[PDB]
Amino acid sequence: SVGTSCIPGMAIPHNPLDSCRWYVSTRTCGVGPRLATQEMKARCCRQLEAIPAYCRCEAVRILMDGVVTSSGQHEGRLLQDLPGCPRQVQRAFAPKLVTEVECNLATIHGGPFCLSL
């Protein structure tokens, strides 16, 4: 129960936190699409809000590192190298998406923070 449903196709959509890709990129390196950063934050935080608290951190972890599913398919690990934006700096920002400063979303840890990430 609970964590058991934090899998793409269940409590987490397939290719989760889709729009957060470009959001962490611009926030972290100024690299990204030509649209309002405020806009991208909104879309990203929206996708993240739609996932219940108990799977939130797991959804960002998939965005960051990826996941191999029942089909043998890999999903996530969107935070890849971009010219002038190394993957690791992006990957370091990711866990910040649930914090008060960002989307300010509750998680399985009880507050707006993703330990164990």
Added chain:
Amino acid sequence: QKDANFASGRNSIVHLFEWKWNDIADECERFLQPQGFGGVQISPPNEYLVADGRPWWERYQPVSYIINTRSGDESAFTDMTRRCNDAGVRIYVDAVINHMTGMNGVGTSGSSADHDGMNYPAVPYGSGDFHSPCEVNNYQDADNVRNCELVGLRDLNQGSDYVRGVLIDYMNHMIDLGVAGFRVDAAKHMSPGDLSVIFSGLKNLNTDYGFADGARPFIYQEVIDLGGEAISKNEYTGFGCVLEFQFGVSLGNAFQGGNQLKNLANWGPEWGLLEGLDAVVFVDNHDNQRTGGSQILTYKNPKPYKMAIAFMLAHPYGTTRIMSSFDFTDNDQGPPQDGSGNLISPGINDDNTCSNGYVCEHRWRQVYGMVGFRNAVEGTQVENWWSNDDNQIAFSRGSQGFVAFTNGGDLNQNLNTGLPAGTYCDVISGELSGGSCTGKSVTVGDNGSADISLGSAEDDGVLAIHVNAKL
């Protein structure tokens, strides 16, 4: 063991989701027993973490094995097992043994939970009782799924002589208190081997609760397997039954018109289901009524939902489980409570339905009706199968009960019910009460024949009659 240990003439387990022990004790006596239900699956009764907002999922972050939660203390617990068993209703404990907490805090009984340093003083557990931290992220790797942390929760090490003894002590304590079995949470994240050793150290059921001599605790395990993984449900059936999740997906899809009801003719293993006596079936449970997806039917889609629950209870396949939900609009929303986190007990109002926000599906007419039907047709096979070669099917269970369904078109046909001549009360549309049927009735001739009428615009899409609801 795969024996539910039900009392004679009882069937079905009801998941009284988030109920307190006092309220369950009452329900066993005032409703469960009279309606012939076999048992109650309670929410985790061992001390868990107090989380901000008191959501439903806090129960899945153990802190100790002290029986003291929002459902009541040990005295309340024992009062429940004592009173429920005497009423022939068995108690099944939700056992969360795969992990502890995902953060630091205190538990429902005041104990400390040190996630950071892996210390759970009230058990006690120290860092040497857990697997080395890592993350579950590869389902094509059984060691990753079982040995890493599930969504950051401290992963216990059941390969340890110490941890095994702790877990066997907890479970044996529950058995001394009269429980009939265990729902094993996250069995998929544990090893068959370790579980085999643990389960085998469990004592026989406490006969002072009306259990046969030599009775063994019932074990049904949560393993969500829809295929293609390094882990299979079949690895767990040698030492217990497994919760069959393919069931709800296939029925839900069928009953929402995703499949032709005529294809349910070969329902069971033919479809990729476990062998019936290794399975515990249900239409929906506490987890997927929230995030199960389009295929899962819940109280929020009552017509197809009730049809699916009827089919489950009419068919002889596996041991049956009934979800008893509290109304909710958000997936993190916890049960009805007040500002201090105290739980609000359901209220049984006039028409025996519940108040205060509990959906009480088990008190639905069409639900306890079919629980009555499953008791009446006990020990019979499916006979007189009929279908219009599309969305209408029907069959009897021996000569003790008949059931018809329409998921497309009106059913107005003379069909063989295989039942003895007589006038029967449809237990779906009504019930037998004081010499009359409060709903539709059916007159069965001498040829076991009867004119069945079930229109597609009716409130329900199923009709059910049996030898115990006969005038």
